[PDB]
Design a protein around this ligand. Structure first.
Ligand SMILES: [Zn+2]
Ligand SMILES: [Zn+2]
Ligand SMILES: [Zn+2]
Length: 232
């Protein structure tokens, strides 16, 4: 049911409808010669769409906009990037040229600039302290604390009980740590516990890469992060 690398042509994007007005978007990308899938989210709000994260680069993001027009046919008016890495912001310029208002926290914008990645235009206020939550239309944005990155945000869709964990949450298939160069390993389990405490009612949990699951993805991620922490 859920799209994988085998089903996605190079530079193409698939959508997966989760609920009334809620989809994930799935793209693929090469990195160090391996191919990775990558997820984002789309949430309807009246006659417009809210986009969470790019599709990991300009080509994929242009394909994402074309796939949204084909399958949904409503305009994307705002986008939020959930951390500063290129799988979340690469493609922001494509969104901006299409008239989308791009958003990220001030931390994400600063880190993207330092890295040389695309920088969302607008700033999301009220998210600088661990445990902060703000409404953003049909979703709630939550800063759980440092984890995969210091700036990582999670997104909850209350009407559908969908928790989008982004790259702070691993799919079950990933049993060893991914890119931890920008991570706070010491804080990552605590940050996950804040997610569990804030959204214990979540039914569908979306990792940044790979297959959705339930709240067991939070325990899974903690297990993997702790095992990496204990590498010897
Ligand atoms: Zn990342
Ligand atoms: Zn604007
Ligand atoms: Zn990622």
């Amino acid at each position: 049911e859920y799209p994988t690398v085998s089903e996605i042509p190079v530079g193409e994007v698939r959508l997966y409808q989760i609920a009334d007005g809620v989809w994930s978007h799935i793209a693929t990308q090469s990195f160090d010669g391996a191919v990775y899938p990558s997820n984002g989210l789309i949430v309807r709000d009246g006659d417009e769409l809210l986009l969470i994260d790019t599709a990991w680069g300009a080509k994929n993001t242009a394909a994402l906009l074309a796939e949204i027009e084909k399958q949904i046919g409503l305009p994307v008016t705002r986008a939020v990037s959930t951390h500063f890495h290129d799988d979340r912001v690469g493609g922001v310029d494509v969104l901006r040229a299409a008239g989308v208002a791009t958003y990220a926290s001030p931390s994400t914008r600063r880190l993207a600039e330092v890295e040389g990645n695309e920088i969302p235009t607008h700033s999301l206020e009220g998210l600088s302290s661990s445990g902060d939550a703000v409404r953003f239309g049909p979703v709630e944005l939550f800063y759980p604390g440092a984890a995969h990155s210091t700036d990582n945000l999670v997104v909850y869709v209350p009407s559908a009980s969908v928790l989008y964990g982004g790259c702070a949450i691993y799919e079950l298939s990933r049993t060893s740590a991914g890119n931890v160069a920008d991570a706070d390993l010491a804080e990552w389990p605590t940050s996950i516990e804040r997610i569990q405490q804030h959204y214990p009612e979540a039914q569908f949990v979306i990792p940044g890469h790979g297959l959705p699951g339930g709240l067991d993805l939070l325990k899974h991620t903690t297990n993997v992060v702790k095992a990496h922490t204990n590498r010897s």
